């Protein structure tokens with residue numbers, strides 16, 4: 740689909756049977772999810788947002804369905820005011836910016 | 839143009855005759871540039887994202903050219919970790935996400 744930017748580009752995601760909403764974010768290197776229990780091992784990672792660095796948990800090889808497209812990759816879990824789908828998964832679903 | 843996301847979508851912008859690099863950022867409501875002097879009235883503003891709050895200066899009705907596409911709108915200036923073109927200006931240049 741084509742998604743305009745008049746409002747926040749928020750779409751429905753499905754992860755582990757959890758139905759959620761997430762922001763498609765070209766300014767995000769990584770995918771960052773609100774607190775949820777994900778399976779398998781994790782390790783800390785420090786990532787930077789507008790207000791500086793925060794510590795998050797990094798889980799690898801997590802499948803996520805984004806607007807009906809299958810993705811699988813690294814998902815970070817931590818203090819965020821929104822679920823954010825970053826470029827690591829946007830590339831997987833063939834997302835581009837067009838103007 | 840069409841811009842893919844395997845690297846950060848960094849583009850050159852022109853503002854006040856000055857050339858800068860900035861990130862095309864669908865996850866940003868606002869446009870935020872590193873410290874610089876811009877003309878006229880400005881208002882202190884607080885903005886929020888991952889890592890918390892940041893104090894910036896708001897300048898309105900500022901001409902800015904993004905990849906040769908003209909915009910005139912609000913530019914926030916402050917200690918941002920990255921120069922960011924947000925939706926306020928992405929919409930002015932007709933940007934969309936496509937997949």
Ligand SMILES: COC(=O)N[C@H](C(=O)N[C@@H](Cc1ccccc1)[C@@H](O)CN(Cc1ccc(-c2ccccn2)cc1)NC(=O)[C@@H](NC(=O)OC)C(C)(C)C)C(C)(C)C
Nearest residue numbers: 766767768769787788789821865866867868886887919920
């Ligand atoms: C290399 O670092 C990154 O890629 N950092 C990403 C990041 O923070 N990206 C920022 C832009 C950025 C890039 C590099 C360094 C610092 C910042 C944005 O793409 C996402 N971000 C994170 C974000 C996104 C959405 C929201 C939000 C808030 C209220 C309701 C819904 N969503 C909050 C934070 N947005 C904002 O912080 C914006 N905030 C905003 O639009 O607030 C409404 C600003 C910018 C205008 C301040 C993540 C931590 C998500 C990976």
